[PDB]
Amino acid sequence: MNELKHAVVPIDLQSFCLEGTLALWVFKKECVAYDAGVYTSNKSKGSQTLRWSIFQNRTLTIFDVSLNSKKEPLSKFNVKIHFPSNVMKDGVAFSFSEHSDTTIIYAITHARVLYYIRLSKTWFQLPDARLDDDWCLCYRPISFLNQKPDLMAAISTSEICVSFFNGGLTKIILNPKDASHYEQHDYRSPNTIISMIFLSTYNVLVMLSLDYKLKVLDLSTNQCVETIELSQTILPLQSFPYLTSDHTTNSFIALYYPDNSHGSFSIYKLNANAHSFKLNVVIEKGIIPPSLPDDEFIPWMLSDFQLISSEGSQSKFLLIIAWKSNLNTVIQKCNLSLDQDESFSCVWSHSLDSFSLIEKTFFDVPTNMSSGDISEIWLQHIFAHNTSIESIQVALLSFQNSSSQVSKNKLDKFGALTISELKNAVLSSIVSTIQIEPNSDLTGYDYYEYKRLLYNEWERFAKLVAYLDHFGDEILSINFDPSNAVTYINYANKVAFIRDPYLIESFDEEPLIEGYQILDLGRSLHSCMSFSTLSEIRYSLRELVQDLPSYSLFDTLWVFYDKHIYPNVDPDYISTLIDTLVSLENPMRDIDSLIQRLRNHSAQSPSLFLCASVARVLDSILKKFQVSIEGFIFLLSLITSQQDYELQSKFAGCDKLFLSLLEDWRLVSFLLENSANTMEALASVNTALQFFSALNISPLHATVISSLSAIFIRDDTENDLVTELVEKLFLFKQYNACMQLIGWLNSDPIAVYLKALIYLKSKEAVKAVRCFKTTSLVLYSHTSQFAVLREFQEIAEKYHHQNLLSCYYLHLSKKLFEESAYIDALEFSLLADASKETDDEDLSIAITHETLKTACAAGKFDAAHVALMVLSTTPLKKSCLLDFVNQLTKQGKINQLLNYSMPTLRQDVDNLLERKAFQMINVESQPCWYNILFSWRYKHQNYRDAAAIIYEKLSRYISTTELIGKKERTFIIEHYLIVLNTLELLPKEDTWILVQKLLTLDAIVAEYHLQLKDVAVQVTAE
Amino acid sequence: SNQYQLPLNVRPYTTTWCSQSPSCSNLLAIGHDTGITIYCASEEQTPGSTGLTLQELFTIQTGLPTLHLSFSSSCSYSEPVYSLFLACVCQDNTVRLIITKNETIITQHVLGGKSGHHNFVNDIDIADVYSADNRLAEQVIASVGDDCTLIIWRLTDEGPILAGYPLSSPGISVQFRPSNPNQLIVGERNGNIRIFDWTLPWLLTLNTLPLVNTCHSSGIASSLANVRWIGSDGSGILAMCKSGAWLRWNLFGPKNLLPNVQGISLFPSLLGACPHPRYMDYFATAHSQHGLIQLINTYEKDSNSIPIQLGMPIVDFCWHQDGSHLAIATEGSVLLTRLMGFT
């Protein structure tokens, strides 16, 4: 038989890709009964969207998992609809139909009521809490008290029928402020129907009754249009809870009867030929055989089946069937390819759901610091699993109880929500439970007890975890979607997907024709190694990413086997394989080819896309890490002993393809680490996504194909996908993880400048600067680099050319400004000013200016003053010196900065300091008095005129402000004296005040004397 | 405060007192772009405000930048002649031990290339180890880097012994345990904190990441800035995050289940904490970018004490052994400031 495989979706990663979660209204016991999903139901329609509903004890829930291409089929939120009572203890209660751009849902609570809810698609897309309508109307159409329902079946937005245990079928019509109703009205009732089904040509239903009659119904008449008699006596003896007895493709429909213990089942795909007089019925096919793995009294149970045919042409039909026994499940699909044959041509696919405990052994050794400590490793195990969710939460706040109850602690469970902190809470709870007993030697402690304590602690925890998913992981239904044409699947609280085996999987199962045995036997050889072994190997290869290209490439070959002798590796095993190797016909020419044989425009992509693809490709990448590591381990376990005979060149040799393979490993494991509008897709939280969005038959398969293919491709892309990745992604977020990620990524110009910008974003200037230094740019004006070349390119174009170097350094100067760190800018701006080999006017000018800024941001050493002077002497870019020197006196040292205004040329200083003067009277400051005295000094350098004028202006201002008299008067005294002295210093020449001289000064002397008299009066009053 | 200028073309990277050796505790080294400069601190008459002034003694030229700097116990004085031993990190990504008589480098050992760190070196420290007979048996230098490696470099009587150890993440600080050179502490960028016996798995690993009190979320990226021992027997461990979050654990009695105390600095601490040499409960931390320094008391005696605010960025700082003075290197100078309360 053919195999199938599953793709599990963690509800927490859903909650990741779903920002908000709104709820609308209308110990171990409580933990077990905490979650389940009494039933499961997923609908979708012809037009556009998709969502799943999840059931719960006293609760109802629903969220958006659609793979579409719209304006916003991506921004999503999870909806919790709380109910007075549970969604019935049975399979019933569920209907979903739309109308026009809205979702209409019908339900039934536990005892006796119906529910009608209408939710807007927009409401799903929006982050918004609010709704400004009557989203629902509860109603009671028929008396359910009298007749309890057993089957609900939708027909239209307005209307929906119901089936009762008694066997009658009512119909219901609701309308705003309105409801009108119709009928054809262990405990049993020989006209009850087991399971109703609906398909429309316009309005026709199909039924199977307790009488075991096939009743076909016309909605207009509300009477049974047709009846067929199916005669089996041992058939109704078998009664199933829930289960769908019938389903459907398009116009045609199928159903089947197990025939009890035989587990035969069937396919009776009826073709309904609707004639004008009356709709006609023609069933055309007998029975379909089963598979036989379910046995040992293990109860196979038909959970749900869905029939879908190829609308392309009647060549094949496919039926998807889901079985379950207990928590365990089996899934299979039967494909029938017929045209004329009354024969039965059916391919079958098989599936296995099982539990492999990776727990018990990995626990023992945490000795190496490749992945050190203890706890962190286990947490990383729980994250490596990545498929079980609230079970964890339960276990955590069950252990933190210390024999505490639930009813209050339960709310404390609901409360946490936020994931990042969860992990911290995990560890905090763990350390507070395990007492560390001292060694009693001398104030020392016994870590060897902390050893067992911790190991078996997290072991017991994760065992209760597996028990909350040996109680939770459960399947119930399957629902196909036309718009997507995909094999959907419903597990309890864990959505999933069905997929065909990939080559790596088929060859990881360990199940012109040669070479394959080497691969399988080899897989066994890899599986032979220990855990600490693979720890050493991963750390070593992690060391083989950047540093490795530095050594001589092909001598390290034997060295890796010299690293392989440390594990068990019995010489018996060795030689046993060696014997195989020598018997090989011609290994390389076959291997390289057959493995070489193993080897993208997007609309706005949703989120289930990215996360489901994340989990599945994580699976594919881990199994890949397996297969390649295998390949290598072998490659040097062979070419170890008999070195001269290896170099005889009788073998083709393999070093080159070896290198290629290591590139491959670097990428893949880079990804293995990485899992730990489209722009809004990037706007979602989970990691590794950005990649899938970067690389967008079912859509999923092809768009993952695009990714994995883009990984395989080596030299053709001429670029490392890692560098590409971090290049764009750095741009958005995750600035901190791309630290270890850039420390990991292979050294390249691209990689270099990124190392720079990132070590910059971390504000670890130094090393970023060393990165900046040890490289340059010839990559500029390529544009292939995204949204980062463009700056440097704009800058290069700003010089009308492409100057070799100085420009880069310039760009680096501005970038150094963006860091607010000004000193490194002093450095680079220098380098820019100097290395210019172009001799452009414009360029040299721009460079000298940025240098001016960087220097003025530093101030410091005196030269940055004659930089100013260069700029002042060159053209009329004096304004630079203005603001700049302003910033320098904003560092603020006049005794030095004025002496620096000394070597500056007195013309330029006259300009500059007059301007500064004007700015200082303008500023009205309190240390402006100082400013004024300093300008005065400067004037003493010059003609010594203006100073006095400015003194008068100042005086005017002090006065204008306020009048307290008192001290103010004496200040003014002092000012009079000042002016008097400046005048005595300037006897002959004459000065002029806009906005006179000696006379107005006799006047101010008069003011003086006045104030004197005033004072004396004050002293004779006292 | 008294301020002492560094030479005009000297850009400082690191500042450390020679507290490790009592014979030389008034020696201050500044690692810069062309070497390591030595200053002497003396009690002038001054005013007994700052009764301590700095005298620049000399400058050791190396020709390349010095980023980290540690004196060893081997330092000595003679009449006059200073016999120095310095561990430091250079621009070529090498780790070096330089042994001098004053400004003249009489001897130099260099650990680099592939035999050295394979990425940027983030920290270094040094301790002298003596035999049972009590001659100088070994000088031991520990260093950590971005190559996910911790390196123990032992210089012994029969010559050098080199050893490398793998880390789960880049090493950002390392320091031998006070009064017990057999033990040391290593810090990983990711929050892991290793206690290690190099004479020998390594004994113990704490972690600050999952412990953040979260009463106030310390943020998404709270990269570990610093971990240092406190006490003169190395009775304690203090860790500080870039975010300003700090935590203290003691090592004696009974069984232990959480860190003993925890808090948060008013500001981010790019350079990390510098614990007081005399008062365990106290440490200093800088807002290096705006040039403020907060003083923190572990048992909350502190109530936000910010004795130091400059109008300029702080490059580095360290306590003088006396516990009342602080030396601070800024981008163009070194200040000695005396807090009157600690006298």
From Swiss-Prot, chain A:
Coiled coil: none annotated. Keywords: Nucleus, Transport. It comes from the Eukaryota. Functions as a component of the nuclear pore complex (NPC). NPC components, collectively referred to as nucleoporins (NUPs), can play the role of both NPC structural components and of docking or interaction partners for transiently associated nuclear transport factors. Active directional transport is assured by both, a Phe-Gly (FG) repeat affinity gradient for these transport factors across the NPC and a transport cofactor concentration gradient across the nuclear envelope. Component of the npc107-120 complex which consists of nup85, nup107, nup120, nup131, nup132 and seh1. Interacts with nup107. Its main location: nucleus. It comes from Schizosaccharomyces pombe (strain 972 / ATCC 24843) (Fission yeast). InterPro entries: HEAT_Nup120, Nucleoporin_Nup160, Nup120_helical. It is found in: Nucleus. GO terms for molecular function: structural constituent of nuclear pore. One of its GO terms (cellular component) is nuclear pore outer ring. One of its GO terms (biological process) is poly(A)+ mRNA export from nucleus. This is Nucleoporin nup120.
Curated annotation (Swiss-Prot), chain B:
WD repeats lie at residues 121-163, 166-200. Its main location: cytoplasm. One of its GO terms (biological process) is nucleocytoplasmic transport. Coiled coil: none annotated. It is found in: Cytoplasm; Nucleus. Keywords: Cytoplasm, Nucleus, Repeat, WD repeat. Transmembrane segments: none annotated. InterPro entries: NUP37, WD40/YVTN_repeat-like_dom_sf, WD40_repeat_dom_sf, WD40_rpt. The keyword Cytoplasm applies. GO terms for cellular component: cytosol; nuclear pore; nuclear pore outer ring; nucleus. This is Uncharacterized WD repeat-containing protein C4F10.18. It comes from Schizosaccharomyces pombe (strain 972 / ATCC 24843).
